[PDB]
Design a protein around this ligand. Structure first.
Ligand code: HEM
Ligand code: HEM
Ligand code: HEM
Ligand code: HEM
Lengths: 146, 141, 141, 146
């Protein structure tokens, strides 16, 4: 993951301050609201008819947390995202049928959430470093599609 | 935008496709499933093996839709209206995939129409498939 | 395609941007250049060092074109017609790059307008920048 | 570049039948005709106003041969595409300022041309192997952009 030492360190230091319950729910929720197409994969989550309904859904929130949970793992294994995400990849492909193009949408929403929460501290250099991470995760999640 | 020369090019080439259309749409889909595996995610309910009757059956449906677009080349947005609702609002197919199917169609026509697939006709067909993709995709989000 | 509730969210969000628009436009370009280096291929004649004058100056340019688009949200094609010809016919910017600038602008707005960047407004700004991009690349080929 | 033994054989098998001088010309020429924006990089080639003007331009034909030849080296080193194309990558970035998105366009036009030349022979499985290769070559050409 072509991450400079000062990049790895930039990513790590900020991640240490993330409230995973808030960010996880906000990112998953913003995906379904900003890109409603993605709602077809979570029909079993309940009512997602309106933004408020979406941000308040406890299934959206819990799932959001699990998602950020997996993203944390990748950060601890930046040198082997592929191996770290192989099972999840197989799952999103063979069992869930998710077009990997959606992985990028979640990555970018995720980046918009980090900026919303950290403001001035989410400087351009820090952003660039997160863009690389989010791309690497997307790519890793797509590796086993067949 | 499809200019007059483009429309002529598209009518003449789809014309020479004739009764093989169904077979070409089916080959185009097989080419797409193999070259770009992510596209299969939209067809988990299909039998995706070589010769699959579902794939031939569907290839035929894809080709008939294109034939109808060619027949209504001056009113595609309305002629393909139902198919737009289907793709964008029901199936929710991400737009990149349209580029992949289109590329695969061009590959299929090239492999079967050596004499008609000149530079100019290739550019006109590419433009036409873009117009069709844009219509099928315009309400998507 | 913009809904009236979208039009309203965009006007209110942008109205708060107010006098900062220029600084925001410049921050968004700086973000784009560092995050997505291939976009620098369209600006070879620019000083792209941090805090450079061209970037800053160019940022005001972009932010004003967005201000004018918001004001003419109902008639974008007409209002943005000159920029569409510039981007699509003179500069020939590949459409992919528009999504990259749109995302960086979103990040910028998210980082400076905490209170206003709600999920609904986020969705409206995104559909808004996508419409602008569509008009600015409609003729690209 | 996940190329199985059979994909590699298929690829190589086919390439040994390709007349490079000729296919290179066709591919670069079809590129300038179908995707006219890619003419912004070759104003020095003279007249590109119509299809005959492009396809028959001796400068287009000469350059196409050049491109196809580098494509060839690539095929002789499928397992080190990044190294092989490193200097060409820097050149296209630092001196020519070519947006890498154009590498994918050329790659696909080349697949169409192979399909045109070989009709039959260009089976789906063989197309698939070539799509991995053109993607691999475009990513390698993109690698040194900074
Ligand atoms: C950002 C990259 C993503 C990561 C790291 C990720 C991770 C995960 C994880 C950890 C699970 C839990 C699986 C389990 O424990 O059984 C999961 C399930 C799931 N994922 Fe993803 N995901 C990502 C993106 C997406 C996207 C973009 C979609 C669709 C838009 C999606 C759709 C699903 C669905 C529908 C489930 C099953 C939820 C359930 O059990 O009801 N994922 N994902
Ligand atoms: C040239 C562009 C395309 C055209 C003209 C086209 C045309 C059609 C037609 C005629 C149908 C059948 C509608 C009916 O039930 O009468 C259909 C359905 C469908 N299309 Fe498309 N299609 C296009 C592109 C795509 C792409 C890019 C995808 C996704 C990769 C896709 C996925 C589907 C799926 C999943 C169905 C439903 C199949 C089923 O479950 O029976 N199509 N399309
Ligand atoms: C929100 C979308 C965009 C808007 C609203 C916008 C607006 C503008 C404006 C107002 C100008 C100046 C025109 C003049 O001086 O009269 C301009 C020029 C330019 N734009 Fe954009 N632009 C957008 C996206 C892009 C992107 C994606 C690219 C490519 C990365 C790009 C590349 C350029 C270049 C190279 C110039 C010429 C700069 C110079 O030489 O001074 N623009 N644009
Ligand atoms: C298959 C991918 C490509 C390969 C292998 C390739 C290879 C080459 C080679 C060998 C040269 C000559 C280098 C030199 O002069 O020292 C060259 C030059 C050049 N390339 Fe590429 N190229 C590729 C794609 C592209 C495309 C897509 C573009 C832009 C649309 C492009 C734009 C140029 C330009 C403008 C030159 C200089 C032409 C001149 O002499 O004036 N290349 N490329």
């Amino acid at each position: 993951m072509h991450l400079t030492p000062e990049e790895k360190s930039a990513v790590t230091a900020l991640w240490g301050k993330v409230n995973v319950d808030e960010v996880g729910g906000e990112a998953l929720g913003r995906l379904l609201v900003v890109y409603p197409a993605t709602q077809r994969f979570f029909e079993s989550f309940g009512d997602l008819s309106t933004p408020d309904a979406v941000m308040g859904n406890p299934k959206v929130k819990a799932h959001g947390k699990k998602v950020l949970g997996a993203f944390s793992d990748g950060l601890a294994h930046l040198d082997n995202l592929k191996g770290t995400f192989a099972t999840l990849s197989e799952l999103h492909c063979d069992k869930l049928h998710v077009d990997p193009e959606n992985f990028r949408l979640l990555g970018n929403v995720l980046v918009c959430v980090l900026a919303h929460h950290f403001g001035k501290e989410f400087t351009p250099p820090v952003q660039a470093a997160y863009q690389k991470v989010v791309a690497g995760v997307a790519n890793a999640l797509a590796h086993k599609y067949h | 935008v499809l200019s007059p020369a483009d429309k002529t090019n598209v009518k003449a080439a789809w014309g020479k496709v004739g009764a093989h259309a169904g077979e070409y749409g089916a080959e185009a889909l097989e080419r797409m499933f193999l070259s770009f595996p992510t596209t299969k995610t939209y067809f988990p309910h299909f039998d995706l093996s070589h010769g699959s009757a579902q794939v031939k059956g569907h290839g035929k449906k894809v080709a008939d839709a294109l034939t109808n677009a060619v027949a209504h080349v001056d009113d595609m947005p309305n002629a393909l209206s139902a198919l737009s609702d289907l793709h964008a609002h029901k199936l929710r197919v991400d737009p990149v995939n349209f580029k992949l199917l289109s590329h695969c169609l061009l590959v299929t026509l090239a492999a079967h129409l050596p004499a008609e697939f000149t530079p100019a006709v290739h550019a006109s067909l590419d433009k036409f498939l873009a117009s069709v993709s844009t219509v099928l995709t315009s309400k998507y989000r």
